[PDB]
Structure formats: C-alpha cells, structure tokens
Amino acid sequence: SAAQRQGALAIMSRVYVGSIYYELGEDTIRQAFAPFGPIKSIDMSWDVTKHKGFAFVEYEVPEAAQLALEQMNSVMLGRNIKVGRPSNIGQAQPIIDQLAEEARAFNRIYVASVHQDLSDDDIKSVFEAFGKIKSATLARDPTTGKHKGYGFIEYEKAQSSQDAVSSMNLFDLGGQYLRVGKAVTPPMPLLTP
Amino acid sequence: SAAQRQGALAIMSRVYVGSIYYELGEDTIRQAFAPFGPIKSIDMSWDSVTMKHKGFAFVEYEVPEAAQLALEQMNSVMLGGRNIKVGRPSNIGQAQPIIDQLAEEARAFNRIYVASVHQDLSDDDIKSVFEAFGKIKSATLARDPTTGKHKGYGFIEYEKAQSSQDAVSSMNLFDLGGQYLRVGKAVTPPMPLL
16 A cells, blocks of 8 residues: 555665764764765664664665665774664565565666766766666755755666666765665555556 | 785684574574585584573684675574674774785786585586676686585686676676575685785
8 A cells, every 4th residue: 555655665764773882973873874865864772871872774765775784784983883674674574575576677776975066967977878768867855956965767778777786886976986776666656556 | 924814814704693583503594694605614602601692603604705795695684584683703903904905906806706606517607607798717616625526606707897897796696506696706816825
C-alpha cells in the first residue's frame, strides 16, 4: 500500500552508527556521514553519567543510507565505528525486498557529494559519457531552488548505468569525491501499477 | 622490512565479526565467511564462567583480499536481518603505515582476486571467462601443495587497468555453477616482500 511502501522507505533511509568514541558528538557524526547525502536528522543515545556509544542517522533517501552503509564501516580516529541497518526491519523486509526488485527494472543511479556550482547539464555531460541518458536531475530546496548536493540519473541501458557507478564513484570532482551507487528503489515508488 | 610486511599481511587477513547470536558457533560463522575464501582459523571469544562466547570472534583468511571482500560483504544478517557487524581488528595502528604502503604498491598492478571458484573449473576456464574483459597477463588458481587441487580462489592479472576494473564490476557475485564468484581488486602487490 502507499502507506506501507512509505514506512519501508523511511526505515530504508536510516543507518545505525555504533562504537562512537565518547567525546564524539552529533557534529562529528554529521560531518562524517554527510558525503553520502544531506543528513535529515540524527538520534544519539543518551545516558546519569554522555551518549551510550551509538546513534541513528537518517538521510532524505534510502540510496544515501546504502552508500553510507557500504562506505563508513571504518575509523573516527583506525577502527572505531561500525555501521549497519536498523534492527526493526523484519516486518518491513517484504516491502523493502519488493522495492529492491522494482528498482532493477530501471537503470537508475544515485549521485552524491555534487559540488554546489555544478548544474544539471554539467552532470548530464560528464555522465552521459557512459551512455545515453534518459534523465539526469539534481534535487533542490523547494524554497530556494539551490540543489542539495545529490540527485538521480537514468540511462537507457543497464551497462551504461553499471559502467557509471564503476567509474564515477569516489571520482574527484572539485575538492569533492562523488559518491555513486545503484538506485535501491524505483523512480516513483507507489503509483497504481 | 620483509618481517614487517609479513606482520601487516597477517593483520590484513583478519576480520572482527561482532554481534554473533548466542547459539551460533564457529561452524555457522565459518560457513558464512568461507565464500570469500577458505577460512584459515577462527578465534571465538569465550567467558570461562558464564560458560559461553562473548558475542564476537576473529576470522582469519589465507589472504588479505578475502578479508577485504568479507569486510565489504558480510556487514549483515545471521538470522533476523541484522545481527552481525564486521570490521577490521583494533590493533592496526602500528601496522597502518606498511598496510597503506602495501595498498599503494598494489595499485601499480592490474590484479584482481576471485573466490568461490567451483572445484571443477580449471585455470584456463578462469582465463577464458575473464579474458573477455581484456588481455590477461596471468590467471592462476591457488592449490594445495600436497594434493594440487585448487582451493576455490586465485588471482588474475590484466594488461590494462580498465580491463581489471570492468571484470570486478562485471564478475563479482557472478553465478558460476551453484556458486557466486566473489571478485575484488587486489589489496597487495603480487609478492609483497622481495
């Protein structure tokens, strides 16, 4: 149902961050996870005595959490943090799996850490180098219209999309490294079909 | 030094597996991590009084590449959806320089690691399937010295970096037999001590 696919997406957008050093606060966390997408919010455990060592970071989109998942299982001054999906995924797993399946019918990729000055056509040009693009569009603040550093690209061909992730992830663009990954949800996840 | 590059490789071959459910034993762990490479050994915490394990263990592979793939691929579920967490060992500090040094040298080669290679596939089979992404300089499966039977994994070297990149991008999780190859970029140079 629309409401269910909505609650799965919500859960799909969260990552458990564990083993947070004791001096580290929401700001270091935020700073360390933002390259995968603008942080929507963060829930840090709280104790008497400072946080219980863990938190929950929520992105605006599932793709961000997936990239963060895959890329942050590492060090906040060699091995401290562990990253993972939230524990109450069970009941939502069916729809999530259902979503991952629908996503495969599209050759859609997610791009993050897009420098503020790059525009849509810039994105289109760099990326259209792996294949004919059906669409490439950066997300933006409705109020302002300024793009929020990430977006989605749709290729005509699966190989094109595959080549792009393989080639452009961690690609140095400005003093920033793009974070690229395959979409984990279909374009508009809940119409009527 | 030869001895130092040796101790880094040793550390590079280990992954911390955490949040192990309380009934799970060394066998489930072994079974869940072997697709990335044959397990050399496993060290499971133990509580001498409770009379059970402390929830974590240390799995050692025969090679660093296995641990890297396992690292990247097992941060997931052993009954539920999310139980296990995977990571590198905590005493990497002193060895980080050499490890970084190793990762740097590895980039001068277009070498990939392939695991979960079915027992019947031979070297040339590997060569053929993979030579489809580029001219291969070498493709060779590891084997038991005693027996000579290949141990399910091996290394391939392409002439070109794009070839190697296309292969990992294309062949990882590639269904070959009732097995899915685990492919990844080498993390060490061919013979890290000469």
